[PDB]
Every structure is written in C-alpha cells, then in structure tokens.
C-alpha cells in the first residue's frame, strides 16, 4: 500500500509553529513524498520558490536513513494558471522542450519522479493531457533504458465528475501513469450557501445531498469504472477542513451560511483550517458524526467546519483496502499536526500516522 504525501513549499512562510520545512517531516511516515510545486519557464521545468533547491536537499536527505522512501516533484499547482499549462502542452515544441528538461532536472536535484498537477485541464485539453502523459512516460523510459532506476510519473486528478468527464481520458492515461492521486475532497464550496462536509466517504442522507456525485465513494467507483486500475489508484484524504460562517442558530448539515469560515490563525485563509488549527477549534466546540457520510464536522459559535480525524481516516482506509486500491494520498503533511503540539498527546502527524496504521492493520 502506497502512502503518497504532499508537502507544500509555501507552508514555510506560515507564522510561528505554523512554519513547516521538509526537515520537519518524518522520513518513515510515508512511502512517497511529493514536493509542490515546481514551475515551468521557457518551457523548462524550473524552481518556484527562491529557496527550492535548499528545500529539495532538505527533503531528499530524508532518503539517507530510509532508502525505500520515494520522492517526487510536482509541477503545476493552483497559482500556475491552466492557461499556460494548456499552451505548453498544446504546442508541439513546448511540449518536447519541457518533457526533455524533466529527467535532467530530476536527477540533478535528487528526485525519483515527476507528478503532474495540472489543475485543471479544460474540455479543449483532454487529448493534449493524454499526449503529454504518454510522451513524458516515453522519455522517462528512454532516459533509464541504459539501466537506471526509471523515474516515476504520477498525476493529481480532480475527483469532480464534471471535470473528470470534460478533461480526463481515464482509460488511456491510466496506462502510462504509475499511479494516480484522486483529489477526493473540496466537494462542497462555501458558494453553495449551505454547510456541507467537503470530504464525505459516502453520499449519506439521500434527502439532504446537493449532488449525487460530490463524495469520495462516487468518485473512486466512477474512476474505477472509467478504466483506472485499482492497483494504480490512490485515494486522497485531507488533513484540513473547509469552514463556513453560520447565519442562524442552525448548526446541522445544510444549515444557512453567510460565507466561508473565519481564517485560521496560521493558515490565514477563509474557508480553510489545518487539522492542527482544528484541534484548537475543538476546544469548547461540539463534534457531530455525520451518519451516512462517516465523517465529522465541528461547530462552535458561528463557525462550522467539516474535516477528517483518526476515526474517519481509519474508515476511509478501510474503504480503500476493501476496494483494493494502491493506497491513500494525503494533502498535506504541513496541514496535519506536524509539531504534535496542538492536538495534545505530543504525537506527531496524528492523521497521517492514523492512516499509515490503518493501512498496515488487519
Ligand atoms: C515566488 C514567490 O512569489 N514567492 C514569495 C517568496 O519569494 C517570498 O519570500 C522571500 O523571497 C525573497 C526573494 O526570493 C527572499 O530573498 C527572502 O528571503 C524570502 N523571505 C522569506 C520569508 O524567506 C515570500 C515572502 O512573504 O512571499 C512569496 O511566498
Ligand atoms: C513561472 O514561469 C512563468 C513564465 O516563465 C513566470 O511568469 C512570468 O512572470 C513575469 C514576472 O511576474 C512576467 O513579466 C512574465 O510576463 C511572466 N510570463 C508569463 C507569460 O507567464 C512566473 O513568474 C514563474 N513563477 C515563479 C514564481 O517562478
């Protein structure tokens, strides 16, 4: 069972204990650690943060004492701009240049592979995206043909049905990718105007669901159906929750909201709270287990946050194993209690460790 974990380079700037650097990550926690994100300049894979190289080595040093730990560099991201990614992949020269620039850059900085995080292709890129993945793998195979350990190629894919239908040719790309991370969270935007868990396992009360597709179970199964081999499918689990600001005395699923929740003390972004920020939130709050969805939400005052915890991630791992999937993907290591100071127990990476334990269990 693969345990793909994401590290975001921008988590370094978070205030106080919030600040997170690769060297603060547990080398034995995950089987794969992905660095996010690498940029693309002049159609060449390139660093993004001024100190990426330094952090690259900081991350890759973890491989010294643990040879099995695999490492990947993720290119794309949210601030990339699907616009650019489209052109690059669309243009035949740009695509070639970029693909050819990857293997060198990776070996040069100590990475075991590349992770495509094009977020997200459009209806017009469905094929370009296929071509890209196909040719990128070709190159990796070539580059190692002489006898090296072949570079890994993975991709983070949307779990939203609309996007999967318009942008992905699951069957085709599943052949070339070594593994796919299905981003099964962010199912409920604060725009929907009602409270809702952003990462439910199942649909739950058929009566109160907005969508019939906005849940983990559906996405996993849909993808399996579309041709993605279970052995190549990694199910994403979030270590963060989506928040909302309540508009009335109603605090249950589907209650009225006036917008996203108050920003977290360390992540500073409305509608988001890192699990460790949640641990603080829980103090004096009330947790409700959402029957049917297998996930919890907590509410206190005029704040509402849907998230995952030991119990829910355990169920989710249970689910994926029962589905015979490649493993779990975590987003992100810097959002889990990596200090181990917030959720008490002094235990580090409570959610991630919980996931790791469940995977080895039984
Ligand atoms: C690429 C980008 O927009 N990221 C910003 C960072 O680069 C900023 O960090 C600061 O960047 C300068 C020049 O690259 C460094 O010399 C400086 O040491 C660095 N400061 C810190 C805190 O390490 C960052 C500042 O908030 O904002 C973006 O993340
Ligand atoms: C990633 O690469 C892109 C393109 O090479 C960079 O975008 C350029 O940014 C400069 C300054 O912000 C602009 O003058 C150019 O017009 C941009 N190019 C285009 C057309 O996108 C981007 O800054 C890079 N990102 C980082 C942080 O490295």
From Swiss-Prot:
Glycans are attached at residue 39. Chitin binds at residues 49-50, 76-79, 120, 183-186, 242, 331. Glycosylated. CDD domains: GH18_chitolectin_chitotriosidase. It is found in: Secreted, Extracellular space; Cytoplasm; Cytoplasm, Perinuclear region; Endoplasmic reticulum. InterPro entries: Chitinase_II/V-like_cat (IPR011583), Chitinase_insertion_sf (IPR029070), Glyco_hydro18_cat (IPR001223), Glycoside_hydrolase_SF (IPR017853), Glycosyl_Hydrlase_18 (IPR050314). One of its GO terms (cellular component) is extracellular space. Keywords: Antimicrobial, Apoptosis, Asthma, Cytoplasm, Disulfide bond, Endoplasmic reticulum, Glycoprotein, Inflammatory response, Lectin, Schizophrenia, Secreted, Signal. Residues 1-362 form the GH18 domain. GO terms for molecular function: carbohydrate binding; chitin binding; extracellular matrix structural constituent. Disulfide bonds join 5-30, 279-343. Induction: Up-regulated in colon under several inflammatory conditions. Down-regulated by hyperoxia in bronchial epithelial cells. Carbohydrate-binding lectin with a preference for chitin. Has no chitinase activity. May play a role in tissue remodeling and in the capacity of cells to respond to and cope with changes in their environment. Plays a role in T-helper cell type 2 (Th2) inflammatory response and IL-13-induced inflammation, regulating allergen sensitization, inflammatory cell apoptosis, dendritic cell accumulation and M2 macrophage differentiation. Facilitates invasion of pathogenic enteric bacteria into colonic mucosa and lymphoid organs. Belongs to the glycosyl hydrolase 18 family. It is linked to Asthma-related traits 7: Asthma-related traits include clinical symptoms of asthma, such as coughing, wheezing, dyspnea, bronchial hyperresponsiveness as assessed by methacholine challenge test, serum IgE levels, atopy and atopic dermatitis. This is Chitinase-3-like protein 1.
């Amino acid at each position: 069972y693969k345990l793909v974990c994401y590290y975001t380079s921008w988590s370094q700037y978070r205030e106080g204990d919030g600040s997170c650097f690769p060297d603060a990550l547990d080398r034995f926690l995950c089987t794969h650690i992905i660095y996010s994100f690498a940029n693309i300049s002049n159609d060449h894979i390139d660093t993004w943060e001024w100190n990426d190289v330094t952090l690259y080595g900081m991350l890759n040093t973890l491989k010294n004492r643990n040879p099995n730990l695999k490492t990947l560099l993720s290119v794309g991201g949210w601030n990339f701009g699907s616009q650019r990614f489209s052109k690059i992949a669309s243009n035949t020269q740009s695509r070639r240049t970029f693909i050819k620039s990857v293997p060198p850059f990776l070996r040069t900085h100590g990475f075991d592979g590349l992770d495509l995080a094009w977020l997200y292709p459009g209806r017009r890129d469905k094929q370009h995206f296929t071509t890209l993945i196909k040719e990128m793998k070709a190159e990796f195979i070539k580059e190692a043909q002489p006898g090296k350990k072949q570079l890994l190629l993975s991709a983070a894919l949307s779990a939203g049905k609309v996007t999967i239908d318009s942008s992905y040719d699951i069957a085709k790309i599943s052949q070339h990718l070594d593994f796919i991370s299905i981003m099964t969270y962010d199912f409920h935007g604060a725009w929907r105007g009602t409270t809702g868990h952003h990462s439910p396992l199942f649909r739950g009360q058929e009566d109160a669901s907005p969508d019939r597709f906005s849940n983990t179970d559906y996405a996993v199964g849909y993808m399996l159906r579309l041709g993605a081999p279970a052995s190549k499918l990694v199910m994403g689990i979030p270590t963060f929750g989506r928040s909302f600001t309540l508009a009335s005395s109603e605090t249950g699923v589907g209650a009225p909201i006036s917008g996203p929740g108050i920003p977290g003390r360390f992540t500073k972004e409305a509608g988001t709270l890192a699990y460790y920020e949640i641990c603080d939130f829980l103090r004096g709050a009330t947790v409700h287990r959402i029957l049917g969805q297998q996930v919890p939400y907590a509410t206190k005052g005029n704040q509402w946050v849907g998230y995952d915890d030991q119990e829910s991630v355990k169920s989710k791992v249970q689910y994926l194993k029962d589905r015979q999937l490649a493993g779990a993907m975590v987003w992100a290591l810097d959002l889990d209690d990596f200090q181990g100071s917030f959720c008490g127990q002094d235990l580090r990476f409570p959610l991630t460790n919980a996931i790791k334990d469940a995977l080895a269990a039984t």
